[PDB]
Amino acid sequence: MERKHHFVLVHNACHGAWIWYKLKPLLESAGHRVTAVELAASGIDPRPIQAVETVDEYSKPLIETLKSLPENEEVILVGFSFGGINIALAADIFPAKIKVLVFLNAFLPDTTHVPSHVLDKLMEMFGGWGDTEFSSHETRNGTMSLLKMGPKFMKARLYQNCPIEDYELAKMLHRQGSFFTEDLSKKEKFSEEGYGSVQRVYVMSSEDKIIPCDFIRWMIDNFNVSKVYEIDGGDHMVMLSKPQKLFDSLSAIATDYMG
Amino acid sequence: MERKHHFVLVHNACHGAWIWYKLKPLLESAGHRVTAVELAASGIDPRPIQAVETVDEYSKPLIETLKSLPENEEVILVGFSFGGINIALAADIFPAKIKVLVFLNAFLPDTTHVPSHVLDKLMEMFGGWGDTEFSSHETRNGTMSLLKMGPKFMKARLYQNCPIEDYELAKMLHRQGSFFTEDLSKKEKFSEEGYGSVQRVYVMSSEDKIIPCDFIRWMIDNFNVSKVYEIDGGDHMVMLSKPQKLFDSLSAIATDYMG
Numbered sequence: 001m002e003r004k005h006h007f008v009l010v011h012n013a014c015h016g017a018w019i020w021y022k023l024k025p026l027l028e029s030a031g032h033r034v035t036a037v038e039l040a041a042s043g044i045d046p047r048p049i050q051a052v053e054t055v056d057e058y059s060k061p062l063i064e065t066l067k068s069l070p071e072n073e074e075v076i077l078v079g080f081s082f083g084g085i086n087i088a089l090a091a092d093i094f095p096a097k098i099k100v101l102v103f104l105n106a107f108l109p110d111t112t113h114v115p116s117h118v119l120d121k122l123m124e125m126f127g128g129w130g131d132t133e134f135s136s137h138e139t140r141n142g143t144m145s146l147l148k149m150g151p152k153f154m155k156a157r158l159y160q161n162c163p164i165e166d167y168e169l170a171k172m173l174h175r176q177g178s179f180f181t182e183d184l185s186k187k188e189k190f191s192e193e194g195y196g197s198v199q200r201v202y203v204m205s206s207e208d209k210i211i212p213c214d215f216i217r218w219m220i221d222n223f224n225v226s227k228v229y230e231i232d233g234g235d236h237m238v239m240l241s242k243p244q245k246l247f248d249s250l251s252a253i254a255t256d257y258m259g
Numbered sequence: 260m261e262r263k264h265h266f267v268l269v270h271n272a273c274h275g276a277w278i279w280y281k282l283k284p285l286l287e288s289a290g291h292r293v294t295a296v297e298l299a300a301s302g303i304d305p306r307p308i309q310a311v312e313t314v315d316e317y318s319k320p321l322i323e324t325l326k327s328l329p330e331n332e333e334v335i336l337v338g339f340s341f342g343g344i345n346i347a348l349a350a351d352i353f354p355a356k357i358k359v360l361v362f363l364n365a366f367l368p369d370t371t372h373v374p375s376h377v378l379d380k381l382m383e384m385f386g387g388w389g390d391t392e393f394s395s396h397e398t399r400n401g402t403m404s405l406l407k408m409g410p411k412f413m414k415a416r417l418y419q420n421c422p423i424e425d426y427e428l429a430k431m432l433h434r435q436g437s438f439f440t441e442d443l444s445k446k447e448k449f450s451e452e453g454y455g456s457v458q459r460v461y462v463m464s465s466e467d468k469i470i471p472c473d474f475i476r477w478m479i480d481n482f483n484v485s486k487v488y489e490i491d492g493g494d495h496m497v498m499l500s501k502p503q504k505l506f507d508s509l510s511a512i513a514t515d516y517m518g
């Protein structure tokens with residue numbers, strides 16, 4: 001038996017651990033261990049987003065997960081969408097606990113620009129937010145930009161290739177969130193010694209209507225990865241629309257970082 | 260075509276509106292309207308159950324749903340497990356808004372004993388709590404008893420016939436809850452003129468391992484229904500294990516109350 005790995009999965013803003021409900025048993029049936037982190041004010045986390053005023057607070061449950069791992073264990077750390085940012089923040093704190101970072105339809109930040117740089121770049125050219133509701137919350141850390149996805153926007157731009165049941169599930173579980181773009185723009189740049197030292201790969205869906213191909217190529221061109229994997233027919237929510245094919249991708253990454 | 264109906268679906272303790280993610284699109288594909296309510300401190304409500312101290316506070320979202328219906332609209336109101344108690348409370352308030360009550364693997368209270376009667380009976384009888392964690396919380400009006408299911412318990416007694424993904428999903432979303440036994444013990448009896456005036460039917464799963472088949476006849480003997488429907492092969496979480504058969508049962512019920 002090839003030795004198996006421990007996958008740590010990190011969800012996107014406005015969602016929670018639940019998004020991995022299809023992928024997690026597939027990985028576990030193949031012998032791997034899986035930890036699906038619930039970030040602050042996400043999923044069933046008892047805080048509202050208004051109480052989570054910085055990206056460091058938002059990311060704390062991932063940092064805690066990594067901190068709690070036994071000596072010398074290393075994980076395959078998978079960041080989805082805004083979870084690319086969380087996993088970068090984590091890699092700058094515990095680089096030696098991460099075998100490889102997996103940027104799944106994710107923001108891939110660099111070590112040259114402020115950490116908000118790839119978000120700011122997408123936000124400028126994003127296309128329609130549809131029925132998404134924007135709001136502000138003033139805090140001792142400044143003003144937080146909040147959003148709550150609207151259902152037409154979800155259907156059209158996130159879930160377009162997902163079974164109707166997954167879309168209904170998401171309608172019942174998605175929450176108001178934030179991309180923390182203000183807090184990120186004033187944070188120290190990610191380090192070359194921490195984050196920059198960790199192996200990375202990028203997994204993209206061919207039909208992601210949120211993170212388009214040319215934008216991904218721009219991010220990778222600014223900050224290279226070791227390999228790129230494509231999931232044909234995937235929407236942005238690829239763990240919901242193509243979980244088997246996502247399994248196949250992760251399995252191929254796990255064989256590549258054997259030992 | 261047949262006249263379609265508005266189904267209001269009420270989940271069980273420790274769960275939320277998400278449980279209905281397979282059934283809702285089935286009902287909606289057939290032309291019906293569906294509202295899946297989220298009870299207080301349930302699902303993604305960022306309020307802990309400790310803050311909700313009374314069954315009336317718990318049930319408020321359901322009450323609000325019915326109050327918001329336009330004048331003369333009537334619904335088929337479906338309560339699952341503890342949701343049986345919520346639908347009875349609602350029927351004592353708005354009996355004329357309810358075409359029929361559907362007790363789905365549910366507690367069916369009577370109008371003779373104190374409202375906690377059927378819950379107290381089940382707690383005396385039931386020996387399989389397993390790794391469920393029981394606890395108390397003191398309020399200004401007395402002890403409030405709480406529970407958080409354990410995952411071994413869930414698998415053995417609630418989800419044993421569900422796809423593994425549904426179990427994984429429940430593990431990521433279940434929460435500490437309450438059956439409000441003390442509060443319900445102090446409450447006035449349900450009335451004949453409200454709750455007892457409403458049409459009611461029972462839908463049971465043939466392999467319910469928490470609400471046993473005999474306990475169901477005992478409840479229906481204490482308080483009769485118009486009709487009992489049986490879903491063959493269902494576990495307790497029958498909207499997850501046998502959603503198409505549950506859809507069949509509710510479509511038969513809707514045909515029976517041609518509105």
Ligand SMILES: O=Cc1ccccc1
Pocket residue numbers: 012013014081082149210
């Ligand atoms: O990928 C996560 C996301 C969340 C809200 C809006 C757009 C994208």
Ligand SMILES: O=Cc1ccccc1
Pocket residue numbers: 271272273340341406408469495
């Ligand atoms: O059916 C709901 C339920 C909830 C918690 C424990 C046991 C049963």
Ligand SMILES: [Cl-]
Pocket residue numbers: 012013014080081082083
């Ligand atoms: Cl995101």
Ligand SMILES: [Cl-]
Pocket residue numbers: 271272273339340341342
């Ligand atoms: Cl229950």
